[PDB]
C-alpha cells in the first residue's frame, strides 16, 4: 500500500499473508542549553521530537535539567510553554505570564 | 440632521503566524548512503545556508505571536459580580466550566478552522494566548484606556461609554437619557454575530493549505529521475559501477538541490507577507483596543467606540462596535444671525429652522435649543457675511434684573 | 560566504583554473571549466536574491522611521503606543551608524486615590451634567474635577449645563449648585 505522498506505508508478508505497517525510526535534532561560558560550564541536551535527570516534554526529551513546580519569567525558551534557566543545576519550569491583579470595580467608585 | 442612531458590531480577521517547519538538507538530498554524502561535500555551504534561512523564519514566527498579544504587564481579572449598566458580556468573557478558558466565540472559531521533515511546536500554548486575551478584555471592560498607560484606574462602565460618546462629538446626556435602547442594541448585535459565525474564516484557511501544498510538492519531487536512469539511489548503485554511477548520482543531487532552493525561496516570500500582516494586527491592537481612534475606517465602518479582541488559530479576531446615524430629517440653515447690528456665530453647532422659528443644535444629533448669548459670540456688523438672516437673540440676564 | 565559495570543486578535479589548464588538454579541460563556472554562477545568483530580500526589509523599516520622524518629532501624536508609552509630549532625534535613535518623552500619572462618583446631580428638579470633568465625592461634599489630575472645584452653574429632568437618569444624587449672581444681587 501507499499514501497520498506515495510513500509505502504498509506491506504484506509473502509467507503467511499478513499486513505489516512500516514506520521510520525516530530522527531528530540536538540542541544545547548553556548559561554562558563565564558562568559554570554545565549544559543540558534537548532532543527534538524524541521519546525517551530525564524529563519528558512536548518539545522533546530533556537530559541534564531538573524539573521544578515553581513558575518564573521566561528565559532561554525551550518551546511549547517550557523555559529553562540557571539557578547549580539547570531548571526547567512552566513560564508565568505575569502577576495576577484583580482591579476593584463598583458602579459608583472611581480613581 | 440625524435624529436617531444604531449600534453595529462587526468582525475583522487577520493572520499573524504560520507553522514552523525545518527540513534537514542532507537527509532530503541524499538517502542513508556514504557515497552520496561524499559527492555533496563539493557543493559547499548550500545546506548550511538553507538550514539557517529556515531557522530565521522559525524564530521570526515566535517573535510575531509575541508583540500582537503580549502588550499587558499584569493579568487583570474581572470581578465576580456583573454590573455593567445592562451590557451583557457573557458570550465574549471566558467560561470557567470548560476544559480550557476559551469563550464561546473562541470555541466556535476553533471549531470552524480545520524524509528529514520536522515541524516544531509553537512557543506559546493556546491557553496562554486565551489568558492574554481574557486579560485584555477585563482591562478594557473595567479600566478603559487608562490601563493602556500608567496602571489601571477603575471607572463605572456607563461613565466610560459617556466619555466615548463625548469623544466622537455627541453630548454625554444622550447616553444617560437613552441607556436602555443602547444596551438592547448592543446585545442584539452580539447575538447576531454569534448566529452568523455558526452558519467564514477564509483568510486563515489559505495559509494552511498553501503550506501543506508546498510540503506535498517537496515530497513529490523525490520521485522524479531528473534525467537519470532511475529515481532511487540504491538501484543506481547496484546496477552500475561507481565511475559510471557517479554521473547519475550528481544529476539527482543537482535536481534535488534545485527543488529545495525553490521551496526555501517561496517560504521566505510568504514569511515576509505574514510579517506584514502581523505588524498590521499589532498596530490595530495598540490603537483600536487600548484607545479610541479618530482615523477613518481604521477600526470599522462609522464612528469608532471600542473594540474587543478574540483568538483564532494562527490569527486574531477583532470586534469593532461603532456609532451609525440614521432617520434623516431636512431643514433650513443660515451661516449667522445678527441682532441689533452685530453678527452672532454659534459656539458649537448649527443654526437651523423648521420653517417659523430659529434654533441652535449640535451637528450629529437633533437637540434644538433657544438662541442665547451663552450659545453665540459676536464678530461684527452684518455687512461682511453673505446669507446672514435676521432674527432675535434672547438675553438671559435681563429678566432676572427686572 | 561568497569569498569562501570560490574554493569548492563543484565536481571538477581542482578549484583553480590554472591548475586545470596545465594538467589537461583543452578539449577535456573545457568540461571541467564548465562545471566550475556553473557552480560559481549559481552561488552569485543566490547572493543576489538574498540581497534583494534583505533590501525589502530595510526599506520597510526606513519607511516606518520616516513616518515616526514626521509625526513624533515635528508634531504631537494622538496615536497610542506609537511614540513611547504614556501620553506623548515631544521627541528628539539622534544619529546612529546606519540608523536613527528617538528619545520619546511621555507623561505617566501616579498615586491614585479612591473616590465616589455620580453621573449627574438633581437640583430643583432639573439634572445638571458636568461640561468637562467628573463628579467626585470627598465623602461628605461633592466637587467637580478634571479627569487626569485632581483639582477639586466647588460646583457652580458655570461648570454644569442643564438638560432634561430628574427622572430619566439611572443614577442621580441630590446636591446644591451655587449660583454666583445671587450674592452680588444683594
Ligand atoms: C508456509 O510454509 C510453512 C512451512 O512448513 C507451512 O507450515 C505454512 O503452512 C506455509 N504457509 C502458507 C500460507 O503457505
Ligand atoms: C562573565 O561574567 C563576569 C562577571 O559578571 C564578567 O566580568 C564577564 O565579562 C562575563 N563574560 C561574558 C563573556 O559575558
Ligand atoms: C513514549 O513511549 C512510551 C513507551 O511505549 C509510551 O508509554 C509513551 O506514551 C510515549 N510517549 C509519547 C509522548 O508518545
Ligand atoms: C430610534 O430608534 C429606536 C430603535 O429603532 C426606536 O425605538 C425609537 O423610537 C427611534 N426614535 C427615537 C426618538 O428614539
Ligand atoms: C447574557 O446572554 C446570555 C445568552 O443570551 C444569557 O444566558 C444571560 O442570562 C445574559 N446575561 C444577563 C445578565 O442577562
Ligand atoms: C417650529 O417649531 C416651533 C417650536 O415648537 C413651533 O412652535 C412651530 O409651530 C414649528 N413650525 C412648524 C412649521 O411646524
Ligand atoms: C442660493 O441660490 C439661489 C439661486 O442662485 C439664490 O437666489 C439665493 O440668493 C442663494 N442664497 C444664498 C444665501 O446665497
Ligand atoms: C434685516 O434687518 C435690517 C435692519 O435695518 C434691514 O435693513 C434688512 O433689510 C433686514 N433684512 C431682511 C432680509 O429682512
Ligand atoms: C480603594 O481602592 C483599592 C483598590 O486597589 C481598595 O483596595 C481599597 O480598599 C479602596 N479603599 C476604600 C476606602 O474603598
Ligand atoms: C472632606 O471630608 C473630611 C472628612 O472626611 C472633612 O473633614 C473635610 O472638611 C472635607 N473637606 C471639604 C473641603 O469638604
Ligand atoms: C450599584 O450597585 C448596587 C449593588 O448592586 C445597587 O444597590 C445600586 O442600586 C447600584 N447603583 C446603580 C446606579 O445602579
Ligand atoms: C432626592 O430628592 C427627592 C425629592 O426630595 C427625593 O424624592 C429623592 O429620594 C432624593 N434622592 C435622590 C434620588 O438623590
Class by SSE composition of chain A: mainly beta
Question: What is the helix/strand order of chain A?
Answer: EEEEEEEEEEEE
Number of strands of chain A: 12
Radius of gyration of chain A: 23 Å
Strand content of chain A: 35-45%
- Helix proportion range of chain A: under 10%
Shape type of chain A: flat
Protein name (chain B): Spike protein S2
Q: Can you describe what's shown?
A:
The structure is cut from a larger assembly and holds 3 copies of chain A. A 4-stranded antiparallel beta sheet of chain A has the order 3-4-6-5, with no helix packed on it. In chain A, strands 7-10-9-8 form a 4-stranded mixed beta sheet, with no helix packed on it. The first copy, chain A, has a two-stranded antiparallel ribbon with strand order 1-2. By secondary structure, chain A is mainly β. Chain A is flat and about 80 Å long. Helix content of chain A is 0%, strand content 39%. Chain A has no helices and 12 strands. Chain A binds chain B through residues 4-7, 27-29, 48-49, 58-59, 77, 79-81, 97-111, and chain B through 22, 24, 27, 62, 72-79, 83, 85, 116, 118, 120-125, 128, 131-132, 135, 138-139, 142-143, 152-156, 158-159, 216, 219-220, 223. Strand 11 (99-101) of chain A pairs parallel with strand 3 of chain B, so a sheet runs across the interface. The complex binds 2-acetamido-2-deoxy-beta-D-glucopyranose (12 copies). The site of one 2-acetamido-2-deoxy-beta-D-glucopyranose (NAG) has 2 residues of chain A, from loops. The site of one 2-acetamido-2-deoxy-beta-D-glucopyranose (NAG) has 2 residues of chain C, from loops.
Amino acid at each position: 500500500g501507499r499514501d497520498i505522498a506515495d510513500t509505502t506505508d504498509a506491506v504484506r508478508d509473502p509467507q503467511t499473508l499478513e499486513i505489516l505497517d512500516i514506520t521510520p525510526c525516530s530522527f531528530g535534532g540536538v540542541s544545547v542549553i548553556t548559561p554562558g561560558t563565564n558562568t559554570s560550564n554545565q549544559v543540558a541536551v534537548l532532543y527534538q521530537g524524541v521519546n525517551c535527570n530525564v524529563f519528558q516534554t512536548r518539545a522533546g526529551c530533556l537530559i541534564g535539567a531538573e524539573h521544578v513546580n515553581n513558575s518564573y519569567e521566561c528565559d532561554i525558551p525551550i518551546g511549547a510553554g517550557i523555559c529553562a534557566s540557571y539557578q547549580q543545576s539547570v531548571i526547567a519550569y512552566t513560564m508565568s505570564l505575569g502577576a495576577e491583579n484583580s482591579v476593584a470595580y463598583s458602579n459608583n467608585s472611581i480613581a | 440632521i440625524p435624529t436617531n442612531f444604531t449600534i453595529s458590531v462587526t468582525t475583522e480577521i487577520l493572520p499573524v503566524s504560520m507553522t514552523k517547519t525545518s527540513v534537514d538538507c542532507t537527509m532530503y538530498i541524499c538517502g542513508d548512503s556514504t557515497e552520496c554524502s561524499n559527492l555533496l561535500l563539493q557543493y559547499g555551504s548550500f545546506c548550511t545556508q538553507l538550514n539557517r534561512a529556515l531557522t530565521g523564519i522559525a524564530v521570526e514566527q515566535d517573535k510575531n505571536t509575541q508583540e500582537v498579544f503580549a502588550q499587558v504587564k499584569q493579568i487583570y481579572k474581572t470581578p465576580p459580580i456583573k454590573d455593567f449598566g445592562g451590557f451583557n458580556f457573557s458570550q465574549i468573557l471566558p467560561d470557567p466550566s470548560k476544559p480550557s478558558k476559551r469563550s464561546f466565540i473562541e470555541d466556535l472559531l476553533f471549531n470552524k478552522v480545520t524524509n528529514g521533515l520536522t515541524v516544531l511546536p509553537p512557543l506559546l500554548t493556546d491557553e496562554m494566548i486565551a489568558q492574554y486575551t481574557s486579560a485584555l478584555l477585563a482591562g478594557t471592560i473595567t479600566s478603559g484606556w487608562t490601563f493602556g498607560a500608567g496602571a489601571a484606574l477603575q471607572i463605572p462602565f456607563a461613565m466610560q461609554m459617556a466619555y466615548r460618546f463625548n469623544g466622537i462629538g455627541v453630548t454625554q446626556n444622550v447616553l444617560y437619557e437613552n441607556q436602555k435602547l443602547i444596551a438592547n442594541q448592543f446585545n442584539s448585535a452580539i447575538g447576531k454575530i454569534q448566529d452568523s459565525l455558526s452558519s467564514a474564516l477564509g483568510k486563515l484557511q489559505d495559509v494552511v493549505n498553501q503550506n501543506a501544498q508546498a510540503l506535498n510538492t517537496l515530497v513529490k519531487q523525490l520521485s522524479s529521475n531528473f534525467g537519470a536512469i532511475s529515481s532511487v539511489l540504491n538501484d543506481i548503485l547496484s546496477r552500475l559501477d561507481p565511475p559510471e554511477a557517479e554521473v547519475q548520482i550528481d544529476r539527482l543531487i543537482t535536481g534535488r538541490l534545485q527543488s529545495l532552493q525553490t521551496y526555501v525561496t517561496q517560504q521566505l516570500i510568504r514569511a515576509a507577507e505574514i510579517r506584514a500582516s502581523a505588524n498590521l494586527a499589532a498596530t490595530k491592537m495598540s490603537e483600536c483596543v487600548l484607545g479610541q481612534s479618530k482615523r477613518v475606517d481604521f477600526c470599522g465602518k462609522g464612528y469608532h467606540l471600542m473594540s474587543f479582541p478574540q483568538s483564532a488559530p494562527h490569527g486574531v479576531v477583532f470586534l469593532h462596535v461603532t456609532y451609525v446615524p440614521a432617520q434623516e430629517k431636512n431643514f433650513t440653515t443660515a451661516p449667522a444671525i445678527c441682532h441689533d447690528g452685530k453678527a452672532h456665530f454659534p459656539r458649537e453647532g448649527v443654526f437651523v429652522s423648521n420653517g417659523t422659528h430659529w434654533f441652535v443644535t449640535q451637528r450629529n444629533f437633533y437637540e434644538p435649543q433657544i438662541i442665547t448669548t451663552d450659545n453665540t459670540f459676536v464678530s461684527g456688523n452684518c455687512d461682511v457675511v453673505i446669507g446672514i438672516v435676521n432674527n432675535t437673540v434672547y438675553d438671559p440676564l435681563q429678566p432676572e434684573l427686572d
